[PDB]
Every structure is written in structure tokens, then in C-alpha cells.
RNA sequence: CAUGCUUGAGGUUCUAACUCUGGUCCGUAAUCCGGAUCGAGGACAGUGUAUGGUGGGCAGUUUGACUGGGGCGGUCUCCUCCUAAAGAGUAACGGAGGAGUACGAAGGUGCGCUCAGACCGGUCGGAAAUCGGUCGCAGAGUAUAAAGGCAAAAGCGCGCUUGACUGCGAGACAGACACGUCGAGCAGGUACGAAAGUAGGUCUUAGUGAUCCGGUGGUUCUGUAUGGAAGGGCCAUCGCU
RNA sequence: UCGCUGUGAAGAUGCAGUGUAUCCGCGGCUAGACGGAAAGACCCCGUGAACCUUUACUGUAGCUUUGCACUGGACUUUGA
RNA sequence: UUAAAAACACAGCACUCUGCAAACACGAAAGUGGACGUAUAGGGUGUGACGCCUGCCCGGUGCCGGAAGGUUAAUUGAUGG
RNA sequence: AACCCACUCCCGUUGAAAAGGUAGGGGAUGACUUGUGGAUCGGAGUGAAAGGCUAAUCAAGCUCGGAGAUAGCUGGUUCUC
RNA sequence: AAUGGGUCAGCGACUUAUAUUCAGUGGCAAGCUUAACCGUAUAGGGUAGGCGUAGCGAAAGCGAGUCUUAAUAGGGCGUU
Ligand SMILES: *C(=O)[C@H](CCSC)NC=O
Ligand SMILES: [Mg+2]
Ligand SMILES: [Mg+2]
Ligand SMILES: [Mg+2]
Ligand SMILES: [Mg+2]
Ligand SMILES: [Mg+2]
Ligand SMILES: [Mg+2]
Ligand SMILES: [Mg+2]
Ligand SMILES: [Mg+2]
Ligand SMILES: [Mg+2]
Ligand SMILES: [Mg+2]
Ligand SMILES: [Mg+2]
Ligand SMILES: [Mg+2]
Ligand SMILES: [Mg+2]
Ligand SMILES: [Mg+2]
Ligand SMILES: [Mg+2]
Ligand SMILES: [Mg+2]
Ligand SMILES: [Mg+2]
Ligand SMILES: [Mg+2]
Ligand SMILES: [Mg+2]
Ligand SMILES: [Mg+2]
Ligand SMILES: [Mg+2]
Ligand SMILES: [Mg+2]
Ligand SMILES: [Mg+2]
Ligand SMILES: [Mg+2]
Ligand SMILES: [Mg+2]
Ligand SMILES: [Mg+2]
Ligand SMILES: [Mg+2]
Ligand SMILES: [Mg+2]
Ligand SMILES: [Mg+2]
Ligand SMILES: [Mg+2]
Ligand SMILES: [Mg+2]
Ligand SMILES: [Mg+2]
Ligand SMILES: [Mg+2]
Ligand SMILES: [Mg+2]
Ligand SMILES: [Mg+2]
Ligand SMILES: [Mg+2]
Ligand SMILES: [Mg+2]
Ligand SMILES: [Mg+2]
Ligand SMILES: [Mg+2]
Ligand SMILES: [Mg+2]
Ligand SMILES: [Mg+2]
Ligand SMILES: [Mg+2]
Ligand SMILES: [Mg+2]
Ligand SMILES: [Mg+2]
Ligand SMILES: [Mg+2]
Ligand SMILES: [Mg+2]
Ligand SMILES: [Mg+2]
Ligand SMILES: [Mg+2]
Ligand SMILES: [Mg+2]
Ligand SMILES: [Mg+2]
Ligand SMILES: [Mg+2]
Ligand SMILES: [Mg+2]
Ligand SMILES: [Mg+2]
Ligand SMILES: [Mg+2]
Ligand SMILES: [Mg+2]
Ligand SMILES: [Mg+2]
Ligand SMILES: [Mg+2]
Ligand SMILES: [Mg+2]
Ligand SMILES: [Mg+2]
Ligand SMILES: [Mg+2]
Ligand SMILES: [Mg+2]
Ligand SMILES: [Mg+2]
Ligand SMILES: [Mg+2]
Ligand SMILES: [Mg+2]
Ligand SMILES: [Mg+2]
Ligand SMILES: [Mg+2]
Ligand SMILES: [Mg+2]
Ligand SMILES: [Mg+2]
Ligand SMILES: [Mg+2]
Ligand SMILES: [Mg+2]
Ligand SMILES: [Mg+2]
Ligand SMILES: [Mg+2]
Ligand SMILES: [Mg+2]
Ligand SMILES: [Mg+2]
Ligand SMILES: [Mg+2]
Ligand SMILES: [Mg+2]
Ligand SMILES: [Mg+2]
Ligand SMILES: [Mg+2]
Ligand SMILES: [Mg+2]
Ligand SMILES: [Mg+2]
Ligand SMILES: [Mg+2]
Ligand SMILES: [Mg+2]
Ligand SMILES: [Mg+2]
Ligand SMILES: [Mg+2]
Ligand SMILES: [Mg+2]
Ligand SMILES: [Mg+2]
Ligand SMILES: [Mg+2]
């Protein structure tokens with residue numbers, strides 16, 4: 124960071140933003156990783172029985188990336204608009 | 220001594236010469252006052268800057284009364 | 296041991312998939328005499344200049 | 359010199375413009391009509407204090 | 410207005426707290442130290458803690474650079490001309506000058522008009538005031554230095570007026586970075602004009618200061634069990650010869 | 651391990667040109683070897699060091715002011 | 731251990747502080763010196779036998795005195811939001 | 812004269828000697844000289860005051876630790892193509 | 893005629909630990925790899941954790957998009 128004595132960048136530009144503590148217990152799951160849980164059920168504990176998410180994650184959102192391997196039911200986890208529609212394409216339901 | 224002062228150069232002059240292809244918004248001449256006047260297809264900035272308004276080729280014609288020097292844009 | 300990230304650099308530069316973001320200087324005070332065009336164009340965020348990348352990634356302990 | 363002043367909109371919004379004036383020469387309060395972005399109309403603005 | 414209940418301030422006195430580097434008794438064989446008893450002072454002094462003043466007695470430090478050696482003197486940021494060799498840029502303690510502002514109209518628009526000066530005639534004013542005529546074409550003018558511009562006058566006058574607008578922005582000029590400069594066009598609302606249209610400050614180039622921190626006006630953000638708040642974030646803005 | 655005149659990081663035993671001169675000691679004198687000694691003390695520089703000064707800055711020992719505590723009784727003047 | 735002097739001391743002079751558990755000095759303190767002294771005494775400061783003398787200024791900065799008024803700390807907490 | 816000191820010249824300067832010697836010199840009953848034992852010391856002591864002395868060391872002793880302090884400054888940096 | 897070296901022999905100066913980035917060379921591959929620890933103790937277990945498969949925004953959040961904005965306008969960053 125030295126510059127010869129001239130004012131350095133990390134003191135010439137302003138600070139901005141704040142760190143979110145709400146996002147520290149959040150995770151996202153691709154639609155391609157849905158067919159790795161044990162059986163036909165995607166939950167918070169089942170995504171942790173497999174190594175898809177860390178043990179401290181409390182909120183999961185599913186987003187569209189790839190294709191869903193089989194028909195899974197999603198329990199207690201959110202999904203996007205495209206992520207949802209592709210799930211019922213492969214006979215998978217979406218309750219709670 | 221009571222003299223050691225000056226000012227930073229302003230980089231004035233012609234930026235595109237006769238025959239060069241131009242685009243809209245391209246700066247043609249930087250001036251103090253108007254050595255050159257805006258011809259066809261050229262506009263005048265508030266500090267007397269000539270900029271292209273259409274696509275084409277620089278012309279650099281002098282014509283009309285008053286012996287003015289005009290910068291115009293023509294077909295390519 | 297573990298490299299220690301510079302605290303002041305991390306508050307001014309945020310790492311994204313495009314590069315490193317930052318805000319613009321000359322917007323804290325003395326804003327009346329400025330032109331609204333000047334103030335409107337210093338408002339967003341921009342990526343680090345190509346010649347500033349090396350000195351900042353070394354300050355953030357990214358290289 | 360030219361003291362700094364403030365123009366505040368006559369709508370309920372807190373939107374304000376800023377400029378300066380010569381208070382010795384002009385004891386009048388500036389009463390100008392300007393554009394308010396929040397309500398998207400031209401309304402009246404009134405001089406106030408910058409502080 | 411005496412009263413009854415409290416407290417603030419002062420003075421006077423008393424002894425019982427504390428003080429005695431005062432006497433005599435004991436421990437004891439002892440000008441220490443304790444205990445007892447007389448004597449004096451006495452809620453004072455003195456010590457702890459909180460606080461204002463004084464305090465080189467003592468301490469940790471600072472006290473710029475350029476520079477035909479250092480000191481003394483001068484300079485340190487910005488604008489105009491020359492040096493600068495007909496693109497841009499180009500140094501010297503090289504040669505000359507300016508700035509650290511002004512303007513709510515000195516801005517926008519529509520309409521209208523040409524200056525300085527010379528001569529001749531005319532009541533006092535007389536080389537020079539206001540008026541008439543002829544010539545003149547810019548030798549005038551431009552808020553402010555100099556250079557470059559100025560008839561669609563960019564100069565002058567009047568009516569209406571707030572575009573000295575909000576979100577942007579194709580494309581460029583400059584440039585180590587941070588900063589800088591020009592801008593057609595699109596969307597919202599406007600002002601002049603019958604209308605084509607013009608208007609995102611002033612003929613242009615100087616009139617300036619990063620970050621941190623703190624203050625004010627807004628806010629579909631966050632807010633340490635939860636509902637709020639405090640605090641933080643985003644936009645606007647104020648405070649550094 | 652010569653002199654001179656030039657050249658040359660600018661005052662040459664060692665370079666150019668030239669002139670002199672068999673090889674080696676001893677006793678004496680100090681003109682040169684920018685001779686020996688001491689990483690110049692003069693001058694400048696280093697965002698070096700010490701010690702000294704004061705109305706430089708920031709503190710401090712000591713001295714002093716007042717609130718509370720150790721700390722009580724009575725009377726009296728005045729205030730709410 | 732490159733300076734023996736015109737430098738220091740001195741007897742004499744003056745100012746100033748100190749009433750005794752003295753001022754003052756060394757000690758985080760107890761204590762000790764001053765002094766087993768008591769204003770003809772003790773400390774500090776300047777001048778420097780002797781003779782003739784030592785003139786004007788209190789505006790600056792010190793010290794001494796005064797208490798009326800103006801400011802002024804911890805502390806207290808009326809009022810308002 | 813002894814004793815204490817150190818004013819001048821010369822020698823010596825790799826010295827006989829890390830401060831002397833030969834010639835002269837000052838005080839020599841006093842604020843004198845000296846033996847033995849004791850007290851005061853490192854931001855401290857002591858000083859008839861030269862910033863002098865505190866073990867050949869003094870504008871802050873020596874010794875061991877922090878400590879391989881820091882050195883934008885000199886010096887050095889080893890086989891071949 | 894600026895420094896250093898009287899000579900010989902021996903010694904004498906780019907190291908190590910932990911975190912990382914780039915290149916070469918290998919193991920697996922939308923997955924790769926374990927740390928403390930257990931253990932027959934270089935095997936084997938242990939996948940807590942780290943990196944990658946998705947970005948935009950200060951954030952709530954939305955997500956092949958997102959942010960700015962009155963704006964499915966423009967523009968910034970991202971996507972085969
Ligand atoms: C000056 O000429 C200098 C004298 C210094 S005395 C400290 N030269 C000395 O040789
Ligand atoms: Mg896991
Ligand atoms: Mg000049
Ligand atoms: Mg000059
Ligand atoms: Mg120049
Ligand atoms: Mg120039
Ligand atoms: Mg225009
Ligand atoms: Mg941090
Ligand atoms: Mg801001
Ligand atoms: Mg500013
Ligand atoms: Mg009694
Ligand atoms: Mg006593
Ligand atoms: Mg007793
Ligand atoms: Mg008391
Ligand atoms: Mg007291
Ligand atoms: Mg006290
Ligand atoms: Mg000091
Ligand atoms: Mg001080
Ligand atoms: Mg001191
Ligand atoms: Mg220090
Ligand atoms: Mg210092
Ligand atoms: Mg000092
Ligand atoms: Mg300083
Ligand atoms: Mg200098
Ligand atoms: Mg000079
Ligand atoms: Mg010279
Ligand atoms: Mg010179
Ligand atoms: Mg000077
Ligand atoms: Mg010129
Ligand atoms: Mg040129
Ligand atoms: Mg040229
Ligand atoms: Mg140059
Ligand atoms: Mg000036
Ligand atoms: Mg004008
Ligand atoms: Mg106008
Ligand atoms: Mg006339
Ligand atoms: Mg005309
Ligand atoms: Mg270019
Ligand atoms: Mg418009
Ligand atoms: Mg109309
Ligand atoms: Mg709580
Ligand atoms: Mg809560
Ligand atoms: Mg808030
Ligand atoms: Mg010979
Ligand atoms: Mg020569
Ligand atoms: Mg020669
Ligand atoms: Mg030779
Ligand atoms: Mg030769
Ligand atoms: Mg020869
Ligand atoms: Mg001989
Ligand atoms: Mg001799
Ligand atoms: Mg000789
Ligand atoms: Mg010599
Ligand atoms: Mg050395
Ligand atoms: Mg040297
Ligand atoms: Mg000196
Ligand atoms: Mg300095
Ligand atoms: Mg320096
Ligand atoms: Mg006190
Ligand atoms: Mg003598
Ligand atoms: Mg003396
Ligand atoms: Mg006396
Ligand atoms: Mg004297
Ligand atoms: Mg006085
Ligand atoms: Mg007086
Ligand atoms: Mg007084
Ligand atoms: Mg003897
Ligand atoms: Mg002696
Ligand atoms: Mg002597
Ligand atoms: Mg003799
Ligand atoms: Mg004798
Ligand atoms: Mg003798
Ligand atoms: Mg005598
Ligand atoms: Mg005698
Ligand atoms: Mg004796
Ligand atoms: Mg001792
Ligand atoms: Mg001393
Ligand atoms: Mg000694
Ligand atoms: Mg010391
Ligand atoms: Mg010291
Ligand atoms: Mg020793
Ligand atoms: Mg010793
Ligand atoms: Mg060392
Ligand atoms: Mg250390
Ligand atoms: Mg070398
Ligand atoms: Mg030689
Ligand atoms: Mg030399
Ligand atoms: Mg040599």
C-alpha cells in the first residue's frame with residue numbers, strides 16, 4: 124500500500140456499505156444437486172445428511188441451474204420462479 | 220526575481236484532419252473562440268468545441284463572406 | 296502465520312465476479328458549487344483501474 | 359461574500375435545492391418555481407437556512 | 410407577622426472524636442515505642458478520594474523542501490502570453506501579468522438597434538454635458554489579467570419568465586492513479602414564440618481542498634430472544650489561508 | 651622502482667616523443683613517492699543521537715483551592 | 731593529563747524568607763539534618779577590603795496587599811424534549 | 812631545608828615513564844600536610860565552580876540482560892556454458 | 893596520485909517455519925480434499941471444515957438475471 128508518501132488508495136476513497144448478519148445462516152442449492160439426497164425428499168436435515176450445505180445453515184433457496192434428476196418433494200425450502208416450474212416438470216411436487 | 224509562474228497546457232488544436240472517418244460525438248477541434256466554425260453535420264460545444272453529429276468524413280472548407288473557415292462532414 | 300488483511304482496504308473495496316468495486320471521491324462536502332452533471336456522474340460504483348489492481352490485491356492479501 | 363442558502367419545496371416532501379445569495383444587496387427571500395422529482399411537477403420553492 | 414418541619418451560609422462557645430517532636434508513672438536497667446494519668450489545642454489541623462490554579466523542579470518529542478555549497482532573502486496551488494524549434498507536450502532562483510470572486514439578473518426566450526471618434530450649426534457649460542446634420546466602419550464594447558473570438562452580432566434595450574430542471578446518456582478529448590473536459594439523443598415535467606424552434610447557467614479559458622470525523626433533511630434497508638427503539642447503511646447537504 | 655616536454659579522472663617511475671645511464675654497497679640531507687598514523691573534528695546530508703534553554707507542544711513531582719469521609723453538642727445572625 | 735589567570739573564594743555590604751513541631755533539604759513513609767540552635771539565630775540571592783558615592787522610571791514581567799464587582803471546577807438537578 | 816604544589820626553558824614523544832627528568836620556581840604555624848578506619852554514587856553523589864571528579868573510562872561510570880534494537884547509509888557476496 | 897588487500901592455510905554471507913499467488917508436472921473429476929484425532933500405526937478410518945458448480949445489489953431481497961430509475965427506457969456488472 125505504500126506509494127512514496129502520496130495519499131494511498133485505501134485512504135483516498137470512501138468507505139461504503141454494511142455487512143449483513145442476516146445472510147450468515149443462508150445457503151443456495153442448484154436444481155442439479157437435488158438428485159443427491161437419499162430418497163425423494165429435500166429438507167434441511169436431508170441436505171445436511173448429504174454434504175450439500177453446512178451444519179449451521181437455516182434457510183435454503185433453490186435456483187435454476189441444470190436439470191432435476193428425479194421427482195423430489197421439497198419440504199420447508201424456498202425456490203425461485205423458474206426453479207419451481209422445472210421441478211413439477213419431472214413429476215416433483217412442492218408442499219410447504 | 221518575481222516571475223516564476225505559468226499554467227498547465229490545455230492540449231488545444233485539431234484532433235481529426237481532412238479525410239479521416241468520423242463517428243457521431245467525435246470531437247474534431249478544440250478552441251479558444253472559433254478559429255473554425257461549425258459547418259454541415261457539426262455542432263458547437265459551450266466552450267467552442269466542434270463535435271461530429273453524423274457519420275462521414277472531415278471536409279475543412281473555407282467559404283462564404285467574412286472568410287470563415289468551416290468544418291463539415293460529408294458522405295463516405 | 297496467517298496473513299492479516301488490511302482493515303481499511305476491505306471497507307473500501309468489495310470483491311465481486313467482475314473485479315473490485317469502490318465508490319467515488321469528491322462527494323463528501325462542498326457540493327453546492329459543483330455541477331449536477333458532475334455530482335450525478337460520481338454517484339455509482341466502478342471497477343478498479345488495471346494499474347491499481349496489483350497494489351490492492353496485495354493489501355487485501357489476495358496475492 | 360455570498361452566504362449559502364437553501365430552497366425547500368412547497369410540497370410535503372423534504373426535497374431541497376441549494377445555492378448562494380448576497381444578503382446585503384437582496385433582503386428579499388427568493389421565491390422561485392422549480393421541479394420536484396418526488397411529486398414530478400413544477401412547484402414553488404422558498405428560501406431557508408443552510409444550517 | 411412569634412410559631413411549628415427541613416435545609417443553605419456565617420459567627421460564638423463546649424468536649425467526647427482526633428493531634429501533641431509537653432509533664433510524671435509503669436513495662437524497664439531504656440530521651441525508642443506502647444499503656445495510664447495531668448496539660449494544651451479541638452471538630453480545627455491532618456490523611457484518603459474527586460476537583461480548579463500554579464508548576465522547565467522533571468520527562469517524551471517536534472522545529473519542511475527547493476537552492477549554481479549551507480545560512481539570509483525569495484518561492485510552494487490555479488489562469489494568460491513568450492521561451493517552445495508552423496500537430497500535442499517540453500526546463501531554469503528565465504522574461505511579463507492575473508485569481509482564491511461577481512450576478513435572481515449581468516440567466517432563458519421573442520422582438521427591436523448599431524459603437525469610438527472627427528467636423529460643422531446651436532441658450533449660458535466650451536477642448537469636453539444635452540440636440541441636429543455629414544463622414545467613419547469597429548480604431549468601441551465584453552463584470553474581472555492576457556490570448557483567441559464576436560453580424561444569426563457573443564455588443565445594446567424592452568416584454569414575459571426560471572432549462573442556474575430531475576433520471577440518464579451513444580460517442581469522444583485528455584490522462585500513472587485519484588480527478589478532469591465536450592456532448593447528440595431518450596423519458597418526465599416546464600418557459601418564451603403564430604410557428605420552424607431555442608433553453609441541462611454567463612464569449613471561452615482562473616475564482617480552489619482527498620479521506621477520516623461530527624451535524625442536519627429524507628428513506629420499500631438493517632436493527633444481537635421477540636415487538637419497538639438506540640446505533641448503522643443509502644440519497645441530499647454543512648463544517649479545514 | 652631515471653630526467654624533460656606533452657597527453658590523461660584535469661599536478662605521471664610506469665602512457666607518447668625524446669635525452670641520458672656499466673652491476674652493487676656505506677656514511678649523510680630530506681625535494682617527491684599527493685610518504686606513515688587516525689573510515690576528516692571544518693562544510694553539507696540522515697524525516698540520525700545526546701545534553702542544554704524558554705512566554706514551542708503535551709504531560710508531570712511538589713505546592714495550593716473546594717465537595718465527601720474520619721466529624722460531634724448548644725446558641726445565635728441571615729436564606730429558601 | 732596542552733589554559734593558574736583578570737576566573738572561584740574571601741572579610742565587609744544589602745535585599746528577602748523563617749516565631750520553632752521554624753523556613754529549607756534527604757526520604758512513597760517513619761524519621762533525619764538545620765540544632766540538643768531560637769531573630770545579635772538559621773536559609774536563599776546578588777555585590778565583593780578601604781575612601782567618596784550609589785541619580786530618574788512601577789509602563790512590561792515578577793513579588794506583596796485588598797476585597798467590591800465580572801468570569802470560573804468537581805457537585806446539585808428546576809425546566810423542557 | 813624536609814613536606815605539599817607545578818610558573819619557565821630544554822630533552823624526551825617507538826619515552827627510563829600511557830604525563831617524567833635536569834636546571835631555575837611558589838607556599839612552608841596554616842583556609843596547612845599526612846597515616847589509619849568510616850560516610851555519601853549514577854539523572855545520582857561531591858564540587859573555594861574548571862561540565863571538574865566518581866578506579867588510566869564522564870554534557871551522565873562499569874557490568875550483565877531487553878538484544879541479533881534500528882541503520883532509506885558505507886563495505887562484501889564464492890563453479891561453468 | 894580515489895577505496896581495500898604483506899603472504900599462505902583453515903573458516904566466512906539469500907536459510908527455516910507458517911499463510912498464500914503464478915508456472916511446470918501428476919491424481920481424481922461436477923466434483924476435489926481432509927484437520928485434530930483413532931489406529932497394525934507412512935496402511936486404513938475420520939469429510940467437522942475449505943474451495944468449486946451463479947450472479948446482481950449497501951442491504952432486505954430477487955435470481956439467468958439483478959441494480960439505478962416514475963420507466964418492460966437507456967446504462968453498469970453477470971450468463972452459451
Ligand atoms: C577551518 O579552517 C577549520 C578550523 C576548525 S577549528 C574547529 N580547519 C581546520 O583545519
Ligand atoms: Mg458439510
Ligand atoms: Mg510570469
Ligand atoms: Mg520567470
Ligand atoms: Mg509549461
Ligand atoms: Mg501555452
Ligand atoms: Mg446549446
Ligand atoms: Mg475487519
Ligand atoms: Mg454521501
Ligand atoms: Mg467535495
Ligand atoms: Mg480535656
Ligand atoms: Mg525537630
Ligand atoms: Mg511515650
Ligand atoms: Mg479538619
Ligand atoms: Mg481539608
Ligand atoms: Mg487532600
Ligand atoms: Mg525538556
Ligand atoms: Mg510545558
Ligand atoms: Mg526538563
Ligand atoms: Mg522514541
Ligand atoms: Mg528530538
Ligand atoms: Mg531535545
Ligand atoms: Mg511536525
Ligand atoms: Mg536543504
Ligand atoms: Mg546559494
Ligand atoms: Mg558554486
Ligand atoms: Mg556547485
Ligand atoms: Mg531560508
Ligand atoms: Mg502573445
Ligand atoms: Mg507547439
Ligand atoms: Mg515542432
Ligand atoms: Mg524536463
Ligand atoms: Mg499574486
Ligand atoms: Mg453579456
Ligand atoms: Mg439575459
Ligand atoms: Mg453630436
Ligand atoms: Mg445582422
Ligand atoms: Mg488520443
Ligand atoms: Mg425538453
Ligand atoms: Mg405556448
Ligand atoms: Mg437485547
Ligand atoms: Mg428485536
Ligand atoms: Mg434510524
Ligand atoms: Mg637509478
Ligand atoms: Mg593537461
Ligand atoms: Mg605531467
Ligand atoms: Mg608499465
Ligand atoms: Mg612512458
Ligand atoms: Mg617514453
Ligand atoms: Mg645509505
Ligand atoms: Mg634528517
Ligand atoms: Mg624524504
Ligand atoms: Mg602530501
Ligand atoms: Mg565505521
Ligand atoms: Mg568518513
Ligand atoms: Mg559543528
Ligand atoms: Mg523533517
Ligand atoms: Mg528525508
Ligand atoms: Mg491537587
Ligand atoms: Mg597562581
Ligand atoms: Mg576557578
Ligand atoms: Mg541573614
Ligand atoms: Mg563579581
Ligand atoms: Mg509593576
Ligand atoms: Mg502598579
Ligand atoms: Mg492577591
Ligand atoms: Mg609523601
Ligand atoms: Mg592541583
Ligand atoms: Mg600548566
Ligand atoms: Mg637551562
Ligand atoms: Mg623550594
Ligand atoms: Mg623542578
Ligand atoms: Mg608570601
Ligand atoms: Mg618561604
Ligand atoms: Mg587527620
Ligand atoms: Mg553505595
Ligand atoms: Mg556535576
Ligand atoms: Mg579517571
Ligand atoms: Mg547515568
Ligand atoms: Mg541519558
Ligand atoms: Mg571494566
Ligand atoms: Mg574497571
Ligand atoms: Mg547489530
Ligand atoms: Mg527487541
Ligand atoms: Mg562488491
Ligand atoms: Mg603510484
Ligand atoms: Mg584519499
Ligand atoms: Mg590506488
Ligand SMILES: [Mg+2]
Pocket residue numbers: 895
Ligand atoms: Mg568508500
Ligand SMILES: [Mg+2]
Pocket residue numbers: none
Ligand atoms: Mg570514497
Ligand SMILES: [Mg+2]
Pocket residue numbers: none
Ligand atoms: Mg592499504
Ligand SMILES: [Mg+2]
Pocket residue numbers: none
Ligand atoms: Mg489438473
Ligand SMILES: [Mg+2]
Pocket residue numbers: none
Ligand atoms: Mg441489463
